[PDB]
Amino acid sequence: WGSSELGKRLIEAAENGNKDRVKDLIENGADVNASDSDGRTPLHHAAENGHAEVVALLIEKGADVNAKDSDGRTPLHHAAENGHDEVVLILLLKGADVNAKDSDGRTPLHHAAENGHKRVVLVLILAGADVNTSDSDGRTPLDLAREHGNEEVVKALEKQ
Amino acid sequence: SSELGKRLIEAAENGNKDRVKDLIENGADVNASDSDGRTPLHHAAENGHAEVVALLIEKGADVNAKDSDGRTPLHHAAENGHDEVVLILLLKGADVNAKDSDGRTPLHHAAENGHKRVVLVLILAGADVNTSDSDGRTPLDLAREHGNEEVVKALEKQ
C-alpha cells in the first residue's frame, strides 16, 4: 500500500502540531482518519494539544469531526477537557456535536466544567450545550464544577 | 438627573466592580449615558471588564443600547478583542448583526482589528459574514486590507 505507516507519522505530526509535516503526509496519501490503538485520530491528538491550525487543516482535508476513540470521546471532548477554546470554536463551526456523550455519558461541557475552563464553558453554552445533561452517575456539569471547587464555572452555570 | 450616572459610567469604565454595585444600590441609573450616548455597559465592554459587564446587565442594563455612532457595547468589545465580554453579551441577547452609523456589524470591527477568536465567536453566534456596510464592504474586505491573514483565512473557509 506504501503505507500506513503514513498515518502513524500523521498522527504523530498532528500531536506535535507540525503543520507543514501534516500537509506533506496528507499529500503523500496519509489517511486523515487513521487511528491509533486508543482509537485516536490525528484530529483527536491535535485538538487535545491545542493545535488550532492543524485542527483546521485536518478538517479541510476531510477529517471526521465526530470520530470517537476507545473511550467514545470526540475531539471536542479533548479540546474541552484541556481548555483549548479556539480549537473548540473551530470544531463547532465545522459541525461537531456539542452534546456528544462518551462512554461515561459525558458531554464536552462535563469535561470543561470539571477542569475549570470557564471560557470553554461559555462557548459550549452559546453553541447550544445542554447544561442539564447528566452522566451515567446522574451528575450534571454543574455538579462536577462544585466538587472540584471551580467557583467561576459554578457561577456561570447557575445563571442558566 | 444624576451625577451618580457620571460616577457609575466612570466606575464601569475602570472596572471597579465594588464601586459599581454601591452606586446602583444608591440609586444610580444603570442606563445613564454621557454626551456621546455611551452607557456604563459601553465603557465596561470597551475596556473588557467582564464581571462589570455581567453585573450591569443583571442590574437591568440595555445590552443593545446605541451610542452617537450607533455602536452597541458588542461593537466596542469586538473592536478591542475582548472575547469574554463578547461571549457574555451574546449570551445576554445582544444582537450579533447590529449596524452602526457606517452600516458595520461587530464582525466588521473584529475583522478590521485582527481579533480572530472574536470573529469565530461572532460567526458561531450567527453573524452574517457577508454583510456589507454603507460602502459595500464585507468584514473579509476589511481583513484583507489590514493584512490580518489569520482572519482572512477564517472568513474564507466560511
Q: Is B95 helix (H, G, I), strand (E, B) or coil?
A: coil
Select from A56, A119, A122 the Cβ nearest to the Cβ of B91: A122
- What's the rounded Cα separation, in Å, for the pair A22 and A57? 9
- Is A92 part of the contact surface with chain B (CB cutoff 8 Å)? yes
The closest alpha carbon to A108, from A136, A84, A76, belongs to A76
Q: How far is B124 from chain A, CA to nearest CA, in Å?
A: 6
User: Cβ of A37: how many Cβ atoms within 10 Å?
Assistant: 6
- Would you state the cell numbers that stand for residue A62, as one nine-digit string? 476531510
- What's the rounded Cα separation, in Å, for the pair B48 and B59? 18
Which chain A residue has the Cα nearest residue B150? A53
- What's the rounded Cα separation, in Å, for the pair B26 and B94? 27
Phi-psi domain of A84 (left: phi exceeds 0; alpha: psi -120 through 50; beta: other): beta
Question: Containing H/E element for B14?
Answer: helix B4-14
Amino acid residing at A126: L
Cis geometry, peptide bond prior to residue A4 (ω within 30 degrees of 0): yes
- What's the rounded Cα separation, in Å, for the pair A40 and B82? 34
Q: Quickly list DSSP for B74-97.
A: HHHHHHTT-HHHHHHHHTTT--TT
Q: Which domain holds residue B120?
A: 1-158
A60–B157 CB contact, under 8 Å: yes
- What's the rounded Cα separation, in Å, for the pair B26 and B24? 5
Grid-cell match 458531554, residue found:
A107
Q: Is B84 helix (H, G, I), strand (E, B) or coil?
A: helix
The HSE-up count of residue B85 (CA atoms within 13 Å, CB side) is 28
What percentage of chain B's residues is helix, strand, coil (to nearest 5)? Answer: 50, 0, 50
Q: Is B26 helix (H, G, I), strand (E, B) or coil?
A: coil
Q: How far is CA B68 from CA B28, B42, B93, in A?
A: 22, 12, 21
User: Is residue A100 within 8 Å of A107, Cβ to Cβ?
Assistant: yes
Would you give the DSSP letter of residue B36? T
Q: How many domains does chain A have?
A: 1
Q: How far is A93 from chain B, CA to nearest CA, in Å?
A: 6
Cα of A60 vs its chain's centroid, Å = 16
- What's the rounded Cα separation, in Å, for the pair B54 and B85? 8
A122–B157 CB contact, under 8 Å: no
Task: Provide the angle, in degrees to the nearest 10, between the axes of the packed helices A85-93 and A42-49.
Answer: 140
- Is A119 part of the contact surface with chain B (CB cutoff 8 Å)? yes
User: Is residue A40 within 8 Å of A67, Cβ to Cβ?
Assistant: no
- What's the rounded Cα separation, in Å, for the pair B99 and B104? 5
- Would you state the cell numbers that stand for residue A8, as one nine-digit string? 502513524
Amino acid residing at A28: N
Q: Residues 16..75 of B with a Cβ closer than 8 Å to A: which?
A: none
| CATH code: domain of residue B31 | 1.25.40.20
Resolution (A): 2.6
- What's the rounded Cα separation, in Å, for the pair B50 and B92? 13
Would you give the DSSP letter of residue A49? H
Query: Greatest CA span in chain A, whole angstroms?
Result: 55
